[PDB]
Design a protein around this ligand. Structure first.
Ligand SMILES: [Cl-]
Ligand SMILES: [Cl-]
Lengths: 167, 59, 167, 64, 167, 167, 64, 59
């Protein structure tokens, strides 16, 4: 839901620039215990409302693992690196699912974001980070209804500055 | 075309480890502040036989 | 299309045992240059005719790579390892495209095969190999019309035998 | 089964394939026949939406 | 050179806690174009001076790639996730080497850090991020002498806060 | 110990052609539960005796896994794909430990083999398979003394032949 | 080479292995013999430093 | 045992794509401010036939 990012430091906003047409994204997430989760998404604007259409294919999750046992804890916050490739945007991130027994089950996201505007109508962002805080606020109904919060920030590495004038 | 508060709606269809499911969702956020919240409902294939967490980045 | 395998050395046939109900499979293929191809398939039997329903999501293929350039050549033959996990079958294989000009582009298949029968009704095979020869024999059109042949054999490693009676 | 004379020599199949690769949507249908116990088969695949494919068919070979 | 990290937010310092005995680390870095770089390091304190002893094995780098062509640009800053596993510390990060032609060549670090003090003598840090800014300040002599700067910060995700009281 | 391979079907023998000088190899093996084992080896010939010098760095093996628990069982036979890249040979294989209690733990080998002769003095083999049967026959001590047997065959995929004259 | 009677039937080998796995240092020596053209061989490996190994020998099999 | 400014020294030995090399290095940093700089010299196997960047995290 990439329209909702706070960009700082003058970083161009690939997602907001893509309206009214919208954008798509495609992703494969690899889990360290063998699962894969692949998704495709279309984002459009219907009058005043953003509309998402999502297709998902997941496989190879171990039967005895936290995911298929439904014995996961929560996502740590994560940081994605985002940069231009092939005239569109690539993202990658490591995410970590806290799980019972002091375990972290990690995964690696490989994403392509594709504006529906031509690349010539767009101001492309340089390499940067996108922090994502994703929280399940409540499991309203076991296995049937969830509430999920996200806060996201697009930024450079401000904590450890360059000595060469680099972002 | 964007506003300081915007609603969104989603439809999700998938199969995970052979398990078919479909969801709908509705949310609202502040695009410029970078915050949002949504409610996702499983309409087919519930209750899900896996951790919802694996769907978090797709909603 | 795993119903069509010649099994030797008495290796049980998980696919043929699954009928009349059938089976499913799920796979993610990871290409060495970053592409992912994920698929889910259902196999059924309708009277005398097998029926396949396939869903595909592929992403992250580089614009300058053999796949998106439609310059893939032909597949080498390949050999899958197949073994029981979680009461179902897992497969893994390394495949290689022989590209025009000689280079090979490789990929790694991660598959789970799921009988529609319960495992209690099945004789599970032990760890073994499945050779696959895949030839895209006729390119009738583009783009648009393809003929594909496959020969497949389930076997043990007979060329380099055990000195201890192991398969 | 006694002997090979009592096994089905050939079995037909039909396929429907739908997907999206690098944002490109396509749908295919296919028809074929094989020999279950000899482990050989052939099929014809037709792209019915999204053709001509803007990527190598080869990435679909193991899904047909 | 993990003794030189600025920790904020009260995060315990696994590395500074390990003196006078010291610590070791072990790492494999996987590159997206097939290279691997594996290293082992011992860190000790000899009087007033820190002493590092490093062993490296690298392989499978493509002959035509930026690394073996010596046509790399510079490292973007990176962010490592660090958390306890097996009574010691695990780290993982994605790094991105900017290269000619607008390319980023990315890699994935998998690290274990091992204190020489017993785990019972240590205050273990919770899951957190370590930002690393690594810069080649000068190539004093082509292929023979380099000057390298690093700034590092151990922190939580402050940019995108929790609504549930989590770090 | 690649000097000891039976090559069939006229496949050239890159290893035997490399003498009297010899060859090197380099490998990273990636285990499905997170371990890495990296190695470099030199092969020489001293009069009539082959001499191997091996350097090993392994890391990230889980404390609760078969490897660190010394509960690995035995290797299944395996099949490597071997092919030319960058004027040297690349190999990849999937190996599988058959653990006590039935589960397999798999790994993926990534190898480069480098003749000490220049490629211009060598007949390079085409893409082919190398079967390896490895049996740790005698555990004489611990811990401390091991006997290991190997049989290896270089061949094409003969069980599932081409209908077009391809190897 | 005319025929197999003109090929070396067996060839000996010697090995030295040194490394560190999960922080554990070890050194081994080994000696063996094989049949170059039949593709068979056997060797004996002795751990001379760092024994007994605190991990499964199997991870060293392809490096011996 | 730690100070606000500390020196360090390194020795590195490796092989990358068959190429053997050895380095020494000397540096100084401020452990609590999280900053450091060092000079690395290749003493065997120079000039390196690969990008130094792949050694950055090992120095
Ligand atoms: Cl088995
Ligand atoms: Cl070839």
């Amino acid at each position: 839901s990439k329209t909702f990012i706070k960009y700082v430091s003058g970083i161009p906003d690939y997602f907001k620039q893509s309206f009214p047409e919208g954008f798509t994204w495609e992703r494969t997430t690899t889990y360290e215990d063998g699962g894969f989760l692949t998704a495709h998404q279309d984002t459009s604007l219907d009058g005043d409302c953003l509309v998402y259409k999502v297709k998902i294919l997941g496989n190879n999750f171990p039967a005895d693992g936290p995911v298929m046992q439904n014995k996961a804890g929560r996502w740590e916050p994560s940081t994605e690196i985002v940069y231009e490739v092939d005239g569109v945007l690539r993202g990658q991130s490591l995410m970590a699912l806290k799980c019972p027994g002091g375990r972290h089950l990690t995964c690696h996201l490989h994403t392509t974001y594709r504006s529906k505007k031509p690349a010539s109508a767009l101001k492309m962002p340089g390499f940067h980070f996108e922090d994502h805080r994703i929280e399940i606020m409540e499991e309203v109904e076991k296995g049937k209804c969830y509430k999920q919060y996200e806060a996201a920030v697009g930024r450079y590495c401000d904590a450890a500055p360059s000595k060469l004038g680099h972002n | 075309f964007l506003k300081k508060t915007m609603p969104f709606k989603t439809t999700i269809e998938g199969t995970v480890n052979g398990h078919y499911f479909k969801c709908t969702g509705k949310g609202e956020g502040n695009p410029f502040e970078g915050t949002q919240e949504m409610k996702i409902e499983v309409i087919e294939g519930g209750p899900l036989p896996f951790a919802f967490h694996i769907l978090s980045t797709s909603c």
